[PDB]
Paper text:
The EphA4 tyrosine kinase cell surface receptor regulates an array of physiological processes and is the only currently known class A Eph receptor that binds both A and B class ephrins with high affinity. Eph receptors are type 1 membrane proteins with an N-terminal extracellular region consisting of a ligand binding domain (LBD), a cysteine rich region, and two fibronectin type III domains. We have solved the crystal structure of the EphA4 ligand binding domain alone and in complex with (1) ephrinB2 and (2) ephrinA2. Structural analyses, drawing on previously reported Eph receptor structures, show that EphA4 in isolation and in complex with ephrinA2 resembles other class A Eph receptors but on binding ephrinB2 assumes structural hallmarks of the class B Eph receptors. This interactive plasticity reveals EphA4 as a structural chameleon, able to adopt both A and B class Eph receptor conformations, and thus provides a molecular basis for EphA-type cross-class reactivity.
Numbering used by the authors:
A (entry chain B): 33 to 174
B (entry chain A): 28 to 203
The structure:
């Protein structure tokens, strides 16, 4: 009964609303409890572009303030590293289940009707301005 | 150390080659940040509402090299069923560890009933909602051993029967 929502985390994806100087909130996706987000890191096939031009990120889960400001510091948790844009196997894939209850003590829990936020920074920089960002809305029970 | 690694889940590059049965809705790969804020791959299940869970997870083939006696170190978090609302008839606080000896490097399907049970593994410290709130890991470490082994290698498996459990790491070694 679950379903998965794919999120291609890169600047060319118009759902982030980048390239304009105003993403107006960034990426917005609506999910249900026990649904998944599959996040695909930027990926490049042969012939590879110059190494410096490959998008690479650290993804953070943050509060609203972190989301508004694109600054994760003291505002959230490091979640995932998009550090292999030329991975031979394909795009690095990271999944987030919107579970009620976590089996991992440092994992995360979700509730109907609530909002959750993720942002990226480009190492070695702590903050991207403008950053790519994601708001997830978990539907109310119904 | 005097301990020689035969398999370590944390060192594995990229994705773990492990087979989950069922393939979806049971054990599921989850990437987290470890001790040192670096990434590791974990398997996790929490079907504490629905009855008759029989969720299997099997490693790849592990060579024993020349060792007869091998040790299986499992690090995991396990949720206290009293920290979970509405699941008293169903929630469990143990899982079962199995092994299977094999000369065959690459069996695609291993039948669940070929596996020999090692032990039921319980947690010394089950974690609660205070721990989730306070970001306190309550990491459990459990070690079991198998041997004397007599084939080229073996498979290990983990059977969940309705617990809320995260397998953070698995290390298989022999003693010097
Ligand atoms: C940036 O994101 C876009 C999607 O917005 C990626 O394009 C998709 O790539 C997948 C897997 O390779 C394909 O199945 C889809 O057909 C593509 N979708 C669309 C709408 O074009 C693109 O690969 C990403 N770019 C980088 C460099 O990672």
């Amino acid at each position: 009964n679950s379903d998965r929502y794919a999120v291609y985390w890169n600047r060319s994806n118009p759902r982030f609303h980048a390239g304009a100087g105003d993403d107006g909130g960034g990426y917005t996706v609506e999910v249900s409890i026990n649904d998944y987000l599959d996040i695909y890191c930027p990926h490049y096939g042969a012939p590879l572009p110059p190494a410096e031009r490959m998008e690479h990120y650290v993804l953070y889960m943050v509060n609203g303030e972190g989301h508004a400001s694109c600054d994760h510091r003291q505002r959230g948790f490091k979640r995932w590293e998009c550090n292999r844009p030329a991975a031979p196997g394909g795009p690095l894939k990271f999944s987030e289940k919107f579970q009620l209850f976590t089996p991992f003590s440092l994992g995360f829990e979700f509730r109907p009707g609530h909002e959750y936020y993720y942002i990226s920074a480009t190492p070695p920089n702590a903050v991207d301005r403008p950053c790519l960002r994601l708001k997830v809305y978990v539907r109310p029970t119904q | 150390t005097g301990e020689v690694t035969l398999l370590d889940s944390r060192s594995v590059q990229g994705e773990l080659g492990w087979i989950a049965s069922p393939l979806e809705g049971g054990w599921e790969e989850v990437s987290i940040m470890d001790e040192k804020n670096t990434p590791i791959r974990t398997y996790q299940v929490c079907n504490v509402m629905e009855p008759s869970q029989n969720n299997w997870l099997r490693t790849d083939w592990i060579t024993r090299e020349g060792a007869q006696r091998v040790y299986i170190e499992i690090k995991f978090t396990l949720r206290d069923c009293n920290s979970l609302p509405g699941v008293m008839g169903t929630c469990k606080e143990t899982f079962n560890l199995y092994y299977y000896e094999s000369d065959n490097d690459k069996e695609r399907f291993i039948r669940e009933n070929q596996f020999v049970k090692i032990d039921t593994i319980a947690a010394d410290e089950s974690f609660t909602q205070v721990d989730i709130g306070d970001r306190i890991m309550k990491l459990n470490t459990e070690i079991r051993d198998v041997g004397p082994l007599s084939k080229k290698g073996f498979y290990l498996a983990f059977q969940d029967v309705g617990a809320c459990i995260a397998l953070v790491s698995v290390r298989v070694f022999y003693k010097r």
